[PDB]
Amino acid sequence: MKRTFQPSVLKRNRSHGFRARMATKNGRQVLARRRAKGRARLTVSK
Amino acid sequence: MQVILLDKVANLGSLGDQVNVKAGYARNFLVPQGKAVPATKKNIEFFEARRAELEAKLAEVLAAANARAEKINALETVTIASKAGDEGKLFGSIGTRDIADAVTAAGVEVAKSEVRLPNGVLRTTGEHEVSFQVHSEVFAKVIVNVVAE
Amino acid sequence: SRVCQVTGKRPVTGNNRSHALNATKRRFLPNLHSHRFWVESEKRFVTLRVSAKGMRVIDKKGIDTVLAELRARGEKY
Amino acid sequence: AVVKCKPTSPGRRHVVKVVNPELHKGKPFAPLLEKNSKSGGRNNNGRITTRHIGGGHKQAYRIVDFKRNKDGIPAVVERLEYDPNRSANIALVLYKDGERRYILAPKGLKAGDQIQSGVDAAIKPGNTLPMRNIPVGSTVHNVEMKPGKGGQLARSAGTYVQIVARDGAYVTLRLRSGEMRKVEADCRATLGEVGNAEHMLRVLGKAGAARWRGVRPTVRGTAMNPVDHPHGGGEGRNFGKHPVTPWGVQTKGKKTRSNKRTDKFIVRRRS
RNA sequence: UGAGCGUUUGAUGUUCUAACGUUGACCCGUAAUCCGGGUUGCGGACAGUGUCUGGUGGGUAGUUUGACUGGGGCGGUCU
RNA sequence: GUUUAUUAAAAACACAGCACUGUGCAAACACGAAAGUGGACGUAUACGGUGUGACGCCUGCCCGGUGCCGGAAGGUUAAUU
RNA sequence: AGGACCGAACCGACUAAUGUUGAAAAAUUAGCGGAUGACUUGUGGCUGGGGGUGAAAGGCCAAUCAAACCGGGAGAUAGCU
Ligand SMILES: [K+]
Ligand SMILES: [K+]
Ligand SMILES: [K+]
Ligand SMILES: [K+]
Ligand SMILES: [K+]
Ligand SMILES: [K+]
Ligand SMILES: [Mg+2]
Ligand SMILES: [Mg+2]
Ligand SMILES: [Mg+2]
Ligand SMILES: [Mg+2]
Ligand SMILES: [Mg+2]
Ligand SMILES: [Mg+2]
Ligand SMILES: [Mg+2]
Ligand SMILES: [Mg+2]
Ligand SMILES: [Mg+2]
Ligand SMILES: [Mg+2]
Ligand SMILES: [Mg+2]
Ligand SMILES: [Mg+2]
Ligand SMILES: [Mg+2]
Ligand SMILES: [Mg+2]
Ligand SMILES: [Mg+2]
Ligand SMILES: [Mg+2]
Ligand SMILES: [Mg+2]
Ligand SMILES: [Mg+2]
Ligand SMILES: [Mg+2]
Ligand SMILES: [Mg+2]
Ligand SMILES: [Mg+2]
Ligand SMILES: [Mg+2]
Ligand SMILES: [Mg+2]
Ligand SMILES: [Mg+2]
Ligand SMILES: [Mg+2]
Ligand SMILES: [Mg+2]
Ligand SMILES: [Mg+2]
Ligand SMILES: [Mg+2]
């Protein structure tokens, strides 16, 4: 059947991408937590 | 609160009076016009510095109001035309603006706030009496005729 | 915001205490009103959002000294 | 005009349509048209703030002259037109200087008729005059509430107010609600009653007609659970509560007006 | 129209404008159905808001709703 | 027509129709500390809430209780003083 | 003309059998309902958790819903095992 993950790259970047993270204070804290953890991939952006 | 009257204000006092007044009356009327000053000691001495010559400006303002009132009573008759139908019932009205513009057209200028129309806003044609005041103590009358357009 | 422009009164926080002493969080807001003040010096009306206490100190100190205090604090109007 | 459809299908059995053959079958006047999009009953927070609104046919907005402020210039009614934004029909009129406008169409107005606005226009239907110049007892519509603000009262199809008194600067109006309200005499009104008075007599006939009109279904609160509505719950059909809105205010008689600022203008409330 | 002592404080009812309101009209910033300023009309010390206060208030929240018992409930009992 | 995605599709929900009630427009009402927005660029032949549920014939008696509406002369009654 | 009839695509899911460490964490096969509409579908967008949305089943809200998920208070507390 229709499973839950229906991929669209444009929706992925508009939902979880880098500029969507920088557009808010909470996404900037998300980026700060991932940088402090030392994530090799900060966002879903390629 | 305590204020000093710079002019005769109705039933409060003359030029210079240590008068106790309501705070809204001081804040919204008496101080934003040239009628009263708050009674701090600097303002009391600042008033008392020129209180002897403060009567001269009030006297020349009263004399100018008397001269304007004589002018108005020398004029005594103003004519305005408006669109009226059968009989005299004006379709519109001849109001303050129209009356003030009519006296500026007829003679020397008068302002918008000087007219004291007792009956209404002149909805009917004919002969009407329009009162004028330039000071609180002076009063003048104008015969006003409204005719068809 | 709900800030008096003269005294700087802000909404503060306290407790609504019941008869059984149950405390719930509440705010104490200032008695704020927008008001036009006539300045005799510059022939103008300045609109200030003032508390009633701020209007009392405006009547006590004059509008010029108060406006100088706002200008020193950098408060615009 | 009032036409009962023959029962060739169960959704068509009860349909009562109104037909107006004088309405313009062609396209509306394009310079007076404007896009208006649907809201779904949703505000700028995206929340449903008015239930049972959504879908329906997309509609263009017709800019209707509610002010009627072109004084002293006569207009001839070019055509009568359907307006999907309102229960009334509109009239495309053409003035003498050549500008076209849309007005609300009164009952006694047809194409080729002449209308005028202003303080010196004749007392015939379609003419808009300040209510100082309208005689007392007349039947008017498109009534201004403030002078110059344009028509607010009696704009729905078949509606009218009565100028029942004139005293000083205010006239007294009997509205379609049955209440008497003071409106100042410089306010303008259009003589006659609004047309299309058979609009009440239409029967939609089926659920689909209301869905075309953009009304979503209303669920009774007694059919819900107690978490969704105060009326919810019960094994079988149970009520046992005083009837309320979904937010708990009584909905069977409890008055909700609280204005105090406009209370001086109501001389008598409705009955 | 009441109270002390013409005066001063109220209670009401009108009238006014000057606070305040305007989701009236017009002008300007300005290419702008936001906003602000100005002019003008309407309303007007009312409405509205702050603090205090009486009512209302499962709309919402935190909770309580005993034990014994030839299982529990119901009944009975509790010194 | 709709519904318990994944044990229930129905007599349940909805429905056109009906009735009650609210609402004069800065409407009631709703989201929102607020600004505002939806209602609606609609104006009582309109909009919301409630119940009933095409249509046909109909819908009787009770206002004691609980609610709602109106009255306010008395009794009682808060801050204030 | 029609929320009109029969019937494919398309949408759905009434019955039965199989499958139940499945081919599949809900399907297959044989029949079944709607099939110009209150239809269906693509691509975008909006509504956020005592909140949304709900033709109302406490349905759905990422295989999780009488209060999602993730992190934190946190080694909550546990007269219990
Ligand atoms: K129920
Ligand atoms: K409660
Ligand atoms: K079925
Ligand atoms: K009873
Ligand atoms: K009763
Ligand atoms: K929750
Ligand atoms: Mg509804
Ligand atoms: Mg229509
Ligand atoms: Mg209904
Ligand atoms: Mg229903
Ligand atoms: Mg149920
Ligand atoms: Mg409940
Ligand atoms: Mg039962
Ligand atoms: Mg019972
Ligand atoms: Mg509870
Ligand atoms: Mg606890
Ligand atoms: Mg026990
Ligand atoms: Mg069916
Ligand atoms: Mg199921
Ligand atoms: Mg099933
Ligand atoms: Mg609005
Ligand atoms: Mg039923
Ligand atoms: Mg009965
Ligand atoms: Mg009562
Ligand atoms: Mg069909
Ligand atoms: Mg078929
Ligand atoms: Mg497909
Ligand atoms: Mg099959
Ligand atoms: Mg069939
Ligand atoms: Mg249940
Ligand atoms: Mg799920
Ligand atoms: Mg919980
Ligand atoms: Mg802890
Ligand atoms: Mg533990």
Side-chain angles (χ1 to χ4, degrees), chain D residues 76-120:
Chain D
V76 55
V77 178
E78 287 220 315
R79 52 190 206 214
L80 291 210
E81 277 200 57
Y82 184 86
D83 199 338
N85 299 283
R86 60 193 79 260
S87 42
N89 299 313
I90 54 181
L92 177 67
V93 311
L94 163 71
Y95 283 83
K96 230 72 159 180
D97 43 28
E99 141 170 295
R100 275 180 184 90
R101 283 206 182 165
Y102 271 141
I103 66 153
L104 289 186
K107 171 220 288 228
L109 207 51
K110 82 171 79 59
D113 286 335
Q114 282 237 315
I115 58 180
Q116 265 226 335
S117 300
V119 306
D120 54 337

Side-chain angles (χ1 to χ4, degrees), chain D residues 131 143 153 162-163 171-175 179-181 183:
Chain D
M131 289 180 299
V143 181
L153 315 167
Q162 261 195 255
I163 303 162
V171 304
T172 304
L173 312 175
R174 189 170 288 126
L175 312 172
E179 84 185 21
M180 320 255 300
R181 194 245 173 66
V183 158

Side-chain angles (χ1 to χ4, degrees), chain B:
Chain B
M1 77 154 57
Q2 294 300 320
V3 292
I4 285 326
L5 301 181
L6 311 185
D7 199 355
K8 278 207 79 275
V9 190
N11 46 343
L12 255 199
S14 69
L15 172 35
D17 259 308
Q18 262 318 124
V19 78
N20 178 77
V21 86
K22 219 78 74 83
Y25 199 16
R27 165 182 329 124
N28 306 131
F29 201 53
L30 282 177
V31 156
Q33 292 129 13
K35 270 189 217 343
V37 157
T40 71
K41 218 47 73 163
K42 168 64 218 172
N43 270 350
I44 298 181
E45 298 326 291
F46 187 41
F47 154 74
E48 204 64 38
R50 79 281 200 161
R51 138 85 184 272
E53 66 113 16
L54 216 30
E55 287 104 347
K57 276 95 54 154
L58 256 51
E60 68 188 287
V61 156
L62 190 45
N66 270 121
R68 282 239 310 195
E70 283 355 273
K71 191 269 317 212
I72 279 143
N73 282 103
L75 240 186
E76 198 80 358
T77 314
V78 197
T79 287
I80 316 106
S82 88
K83 184 126 214 173
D86 325 89
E87 300 193 270
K89 301 204 27 254
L90 310 194
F91 286 133
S93 271
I94 297 302
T96 279
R97 232 156 70 246
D98 304 286
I99 285 173
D101 293 326
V103 201
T104 59
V108 200
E109 78 82 16
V110 82
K112 226 213 165 169
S113 64
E114 330 271 25
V115 277
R116 300 258 141 334
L117 305 100
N119 302 51
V121 75
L122 268 67
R123 206 91 54 185
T124 181
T125 226
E127 275 328 318
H128 310 290
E129 37 271 20
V130 170
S131 166
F132 279 76
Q133 57 144 51
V134 199
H135 212 266
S136 284
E137 282 93 354
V138 80
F139 268 141
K141 261 54 127 165
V142 175
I143 277 304
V144 163
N145 72 78
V146 190
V147 299
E149 204 200 336

Side-chain angles (χ1 to χ4, degrees), chain D residues 11-12 14-17 54-57 59 82 202-216:
Chain D
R12 273 288 262 210
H14 308 281
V15 179
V16 174
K17 324 192 296 180
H57 215 281
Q59 312 171 314
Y82 184 86
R202 83 176 71 243
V203 176
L204 292 206
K206 52 170 191 154
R211 301 293 315 267
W212 306 334
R213 266 159 194 85
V215 7
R216 298 200 74 251

